[PDB]
Structures are given as C-alpha cells and as structure tokens.
PQR file of N, CA, C, O and H, with PARSE charges and radii, in Angstrom:
ATOM      1  N   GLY A   1     -89.679 172.661  22.367 -0.4000 1.5000
ATOM      2  CA  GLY A   1     -89.389 174.035  21.879 -0.0000 2.0000
ATOM      3  C   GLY A   1     -88.867 174.995  22.964  0.5500 1.7000
ATOM      4  O   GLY A   1     -87.801 174.766  23.534 -0.5500 1.4000
ATOM      5  N   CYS A   2     -89.619 176.065  23.245 -0.4000 1.5000
ATOM      6  CA  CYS A   2     -89.221 177.111  24.227 -0.0000 2.0000
ATOM      7  C   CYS A   2     -90.090 177.084  25.530  0.5500 1.7000
ATOM      8  O   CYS A   2     -91.047 177.849  25.651 -0.5500 1.4000
ATOM      9  H   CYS A   2     -90.486 176.252  22.781  0.4000 1.0000
ATOM     10  N   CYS A   3     -89.743 176.205  26.481 -0.4000 1.5000
ATOM     11  CA  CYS A   3     -90.381 176.176  27.825 -0.0000 2.0000
ATOM     12  C   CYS A   3     -89.745 177.189  28.841  0.5500 1.7000
ATOM     13  O   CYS A   3     -88.526 177.362  28.851 -0.5500 1.4000
ATOM     14  H   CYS A   3     -88.966 175.584  26.382  0.4000 1.0000
ATOM     15  N   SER A   4     -90.569 177.843  29.676 -0.4000 1.5000
ATOM     16  CA  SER A   4     -90.073 178.726  30.779 -0.0000 2.0000
ATOM     17  C   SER A   4     -89.600 177.969  32.076  0.5500 1.7000
ATOM     18  O   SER A   4     -90.176 178.134  33.151 -0.5500 1.4000
ATOM     19  H   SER A   4     -91.559 177.702  29.668  0.4000 1.0000
ATOM     20  N   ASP A   5     -88.545 177.150  31.923 -0.4000 1.5000
ATOM     21  CA  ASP A   5     -87.984 176.273  32.988 -0.0000 2.0000
ATOM     22  C   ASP A   5     -86.494 175.880  32.637  0.5500 1.7000
ATOM     23  O   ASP A   5     -86.099 175.896  31.472 -0.5500 1.4000
ATOM     24  H   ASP A   5     -88.077 177.017  31.049  0.4000 1.0000
ATOM     25  N   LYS A   6     -85.710 175.536  33.671 -0.4000 1.5000
ATOM     26  CA  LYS A   6     -84.265 175.191  33.548 -0.0000 2.0000
ATOM     27  C   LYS A   6     -83.872 173.943  32.669  0.5500 1.7000
ATOM     28  O   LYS A   6     -83.125 174.113  31.705 -0.5500 1.4000
ATOM     29  H   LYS A   6     -86.031 175.523  34.618  0.4000 1.0000
ATOM     30  N   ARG A   7     -84.347 172.722  32.972 -0.4000 1.5000
ATOM     31  CA  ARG A   7     -83.876 171.473  32.284 -0.0000 2.0000
ATOM     32  C   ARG A   7     -84.577 171.091  30.937  0.5500 1.7000
ATOM     33  O   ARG A   7     -83.910 170.540  30.062 -0.5500 1.4000
ATOM     34  H   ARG A   7     -84.953 172.584  33.755  0.4000 1.0000
ATOM     35  N   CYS A   8     -85.882 171.363  30.748 -0.4000 1.5000
ATOM     36  CA  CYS A   8     -86.563 171.201  29.430 -0.0000 2.0000
ATOM     37  C   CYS A   8     -85.953 171.987  28.209  0.5500 1.7000
ATOM     38  O   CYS A   8     -85.731 171.379  27.161 -0.5500 1.4000
ATOM     39  H   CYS A   8     -86.425 171.811  31.459  0.4000 1.0000
ATOM     40  N   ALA A   9     -85.686 173.300  28.328 -0.4000 1.5000
ATOM     41  CA  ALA A   9     -85.081 174.116  27.240 -0.0000 2.0000
ATOM     42  C   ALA A   9     -84.186 175.257  27.820  0.5500 1.7000
ATOM     43  O   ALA A   9     -84.683 176.356  28.064 -0.5500 1.4000
ATOM     44  H   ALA A   9     -85.867 173.794  29.179  0.4000 1.0000
ATOM     45  N   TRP A  10     -82.880 174.997  28.038 -0.4000 1.5000
ATOM     46  CA  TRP A  10     -81.869 176.020  28.467 -0.0000 2.0000
ATOM     47  C   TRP A  10     -82.231 176.920  29.704  0.5500 1.7000
ATOM     48  O   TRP A  10     -81.961 176.535  30.841 -0.5500 1.4000
ATOM     49  H   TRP A  10     -82.476 174.104  27.840  0.4000 1.0000
ATOM     50  N   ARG A  11     -82.829 178.090  29.471 -0.4000 1.5000
ATOM     51  CA  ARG A  11     -83.858 178.673  30.378 -0.0000 2.0000
ATOM     52  C   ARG A  11     -84.724 179.644  29.498  0.5500 1.7000
ATOM     53  O   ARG A  11     -84.534 180.858  29.569 -0.5500 1.4000
ATOM     54  H   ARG A  11     -83.048 178.403  28.547  0.4000 1.0000
ATOM     55  N   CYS A  12     -85.657 179.117  28.685 -0.4000 1.5000
ATOM     56  CA  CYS A  12     -86.198 179.857  27.513 -0.0000 2.0000
ATOM     57  C   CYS A  12     -87.453 180.737  27.822  0.5500 1.7000
ATOM     58  O   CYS A  12     -87.983 181.392  26.925 -0.5500 1.4000
ATOM     59  H   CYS A  12     -85.812 178.131  28.627  0.4000 1.0000
TER
END
C-alpha cells in the first residue's frame, strides 16, 4: 500500500 520509503511505494 502506502509505505514512507522510495522503492516499496513511489515515495508515499
């Protein structure tokens, strides 16, 4: 879903 990191989810 929406992780606070670069490669897991866009930069969410």
